[PDB]
Structure 1
Amino acid sequence: MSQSNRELVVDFLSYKLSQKGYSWSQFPMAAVKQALREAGDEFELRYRRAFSDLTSQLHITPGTAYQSFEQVVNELFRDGVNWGRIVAFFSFGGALCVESVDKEMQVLVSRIAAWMATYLNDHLEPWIQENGGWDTFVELYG
């Protein structure tokens, strides 16, 4: 999970940046990654606001600390965790990275990736592991 999740986060963020015309140079596993990439595209297809409100609540700068990131991300889970909210969490991180590149703060991309892995391992893996693990995610979104 530690390294697994780190790799999962980097893959999704790299996918999103590539897809959107940005560089990703600031950085069954294969089945998990693919399922998550598609899940995110489906999610963003419906919700296209890009978490403007949440990103505004965060207004990320090189000075922003994890605790602030954690506090804002917690908003997605006020009613607890579920697969859709985990997908939204990945999408939110992608949105934060795109925003960071648009502001010429590409230095933040690897930082956001680290923050996401930390948050995933700390707050989301408990629920994930209790509900089938990533195997169930693939089975549900693959």
Structure 2
Amino acid sequence: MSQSNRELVVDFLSYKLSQKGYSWSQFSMAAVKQALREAGDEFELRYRRAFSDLTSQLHITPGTAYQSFEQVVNELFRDGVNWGRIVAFFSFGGALCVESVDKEMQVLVSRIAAWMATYLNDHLEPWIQENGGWDTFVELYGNN
């Protein structure tokens, strides 16, 4: 268990958290990192327009700490093991995390990341490292 999946998820998150408007986030191979970096960054610029998919997905839920987690997580399960949906999934969290620190909410990303990282190694990691996730994504993205 190299935790390549768990590492990439938090790595990409930290990468977007280093965009603009970060306080606490500043003081505290298959080339999956590159693949997620390129596609994720290009998607982020479209999500950071405020009036994007994020607005319709989150819609400012009256419980942006736990309800937001289910909302984002359920989105992935709304399609399933889809390499096209996983991109949007990362985009949602990626753009959301930036605005979470930019608006000094903290609890938003601090809680979601915690639950996400937990379920990640708990079920997502052994799932990806069996059925196929980022490994198969690169196959059609940068190895096709």
Matched residues, number: 142
Cα distance change, pair 53–83 in 1 and its aligned pair in 2 (3 A): closer
Compared with structure 1, are the counterparts of its residues 122 and 78 closer, same or farther at alpha carbon in structure 2 (3 Å cutoff)?
farther
Q: Kindly provide the CA deviation profile for residues 63-104 of structure 1, in whole angstroms up to 9, marking residues without a partner as x.
A: 755465124431343232311211211111112211211221
- Which range is displaced more, 55-64 or 117-126? 55-64
Secondary structure of residue in 2 paired with 1:18: coil
Question: Aligned partners of 2:139, 2:72: CA distance in 1, in Å?
Answer: 29
Gaps of 5+ in 1: none
Any idea what the Cα deviations from partners look like across 1:23-43, whole Å, max 9, x if unmatched? 573689682212111121243
User: Residues of 2 paired with 1:68 and 1:125: CA distance?
Assistant: 21
User: 1:88–1:36: structure 2 CA closer, same or farther, 3 Å change rule?
Assistant: same
CA separation of 1:52 and 1:107: change in aligned 2, threshold 3 A: same
Structure 2-normalised TM-score?
A: 0.65
Partner of 1:3: 3
Q: 1:75 to 1:30 in 2, by over 3 A?
A: closer
Matched-pair contact (CA < 8 Å) for 1:32–1:134: yes
Distance 1:13 1:36 in 2: 11
CA distance in 1, matches of 2:29, 2:70: 26
